[PDB]
Amino acid sequence: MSEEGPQVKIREASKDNVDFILSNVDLAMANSLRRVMIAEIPTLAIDSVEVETNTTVLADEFIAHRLGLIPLQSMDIEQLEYSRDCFCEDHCDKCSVVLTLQAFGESESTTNVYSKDLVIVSNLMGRNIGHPIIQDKEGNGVLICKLRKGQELKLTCVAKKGIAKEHAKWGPAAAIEFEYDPWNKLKHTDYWYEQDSAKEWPQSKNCEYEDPPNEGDPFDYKAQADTFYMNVESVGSIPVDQVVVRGIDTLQKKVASILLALTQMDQDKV
């Protein structure tokens, strides 16, 4: 038995989901993270396409758009600075990952362009970063586009840091789940019905884990809220755990920078 407060107790688990029961915290807190995960978690994806040749049917920017969505590796990310900070005029191996792509329609039968075909050309610096996250059954992953006979397509991409605020393509997120007080004992809702509130409205799997109502008892007006059944998914770029830990982290960072500005602010005065 130990640990100051906000304790968790992972329910189920998988490489693409961390169904867990986080408990004893401020809902504010819960949500706070929830957000942080979707929004400000550092990732990586393409952010600059350089079309050389293209005969496809998808015109440039179409391809150029999807390329930014193709999830890319980002385990280490935290050791690949944002272009903006680094001093390299434009970009460099200390801020970005460079990829290539080339297709020609030889098989006179619809040739496909998959994320697996991306080519890391810049020094991976020896770090899990820039790999075309694939979960495909075969291992082809993320169908980019197709082409016919002599249809060609030469590109050259450049991945950079980035977070979900700057764009969604940097969303390590995917979609979290959220719920609390499955038996609405705080009455944070006023179920709409036609007849039996209980009937029309389906119950939730998250009731088992909490005591039913039990009529008699009056209304607990002192009732607050701990225990939140979240379900942090993931898209790959980051291991389902980090999209939670780092979430727990990035938030915590900012929270401190506030103190940081409260220090730098004091020192200031003549």
């Binding site: 015109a59 758009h65 999807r66 969505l69 979900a164 764009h167 969604a168 393509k169 969303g171």
Partner: peptide, 12 residues
């Protein structure tokens, strides 16, 4: 917004 990004409703 997020969805607009992922390409929701983009046209030509």
């Amino acid at each position: 917004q997020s969805s607009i990004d992922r390409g929701l409703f983009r046209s030509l």
